[PDB]
Design a protein around this ligand. Sequence first.
Ligand SMILES: OC[C@H]1O[C@@H](O[C@H]2[C@H](O)[C@@H](O)[C@H](O)O[C@@H]2CO)[C@H](O)[C@@H](O)[C@H]1O
Ligand SMILES: OC[C@H]1O[C@@H](O[C@H]2[C@H](O)[C@@H](O)[C@H](O)O[C@@H]2CO)[C@H](O)[C@@H](O)[C@H]1O
Lengths: 159, 158
Amino acid sequence: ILWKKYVKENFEMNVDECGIEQGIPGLGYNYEVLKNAVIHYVTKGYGTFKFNGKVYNLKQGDIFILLKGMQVEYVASIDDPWEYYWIGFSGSNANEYLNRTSITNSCVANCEENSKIPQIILNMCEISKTYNPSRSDDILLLKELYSLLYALIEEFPKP
Amino acid sequence: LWKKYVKENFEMNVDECGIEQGIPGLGYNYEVLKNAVIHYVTKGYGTFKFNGKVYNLKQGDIFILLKGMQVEYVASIDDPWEYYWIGFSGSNANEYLNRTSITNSCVANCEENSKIPQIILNMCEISKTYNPSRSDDILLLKELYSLLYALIEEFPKP
Ligand SMILES: OC[C@H]1O[C@@H](O[C@H]2[C@H](O)[C@@H](O)[C@H](O)O[C@@H]2CO)[C@H](O)[C@@H](O)[C@H]1O
Ligand SMILES: OC[C@H]1O[C@@H](O[C@H]2[C@H](O)[C@@H](O)[C@H](O)O[C@@H]2CO)[C@H](O)[C@@H](O)[C@H]1O
């Protein structure tokens, strides 16, 4: 329904792509990640995420993150296929900030009831649907990416 | 408050945040060396002089200093201004400044429902207890993107 790809115009902090996908029962993806980092938020239904010999059964409110070099498989459930929203991002600041959160350890997490993460990801995907750089949507998306990385660090801090 | 930060970023950078209560009849007369410095007048009165114009500024006014400007700004004798300032730099910062009309005269008034005052005050508050181990660096960049967005929204080019 949405897969907006942006230019790699920034090297410190960059929004690479925003997407929304309703899974087809029993179908998904099996590949080595090429993109820098892609955070997925499960909005509905059920799917599986497999990485490094572990198989996670994910549901509404779960996050999984893809990082360059990871061999992953993620597949919608046969009975009740997931919908997910994703933010792909890159840059030297982005990668330093990712090292301040525990989520990059296992690459899976659950959003707490009062999490700020869902609203930010949904808002970035909404902006991306009618992206207009002449209306400074580029500034708004970078503001939201900084808010997202701040929220990940606040909710999933390193020891 | 006068917190100076490293020039650690080149696309978008918070250079400094400050708060100054002016001394009656005193101020500054110099060629600006910093990239860009937005000042917000929180109290009182002062004068800003640039390119042969003399502005009488008051609470709610903004003035912006840009590299190369020869400026004089002086607190009023009767009720000296307090001002808050955000110094910033970077290739993104300078592109975004070209999307606003405020860089034409370098003076403006914040309208009643403006988001600018709350952002500038919040950045100066964060800067007072700046702790990078608690990711205050990310928070200040988030607020700088919010500030430049607000300037474009409230002071658009025609
Ligand atoms: O990037 C999130 C996005 O990934 C898609 O999978 C793509 C991937 O983006 C691409 O770099 C790789 O070369 O091929 C994959 C397709 O096998 C997913 O299709 C999409 O649902 C999102 O998860
Ligand atoms: O940068 C805003 C800040 O400027 C101070 O003035 C300094 C200026 O920053 C510095 O670049 C220059 O070399 O010396 C000036 C003092 O003469 C102001 O003092 C301060 O109130 C702010 O306006």
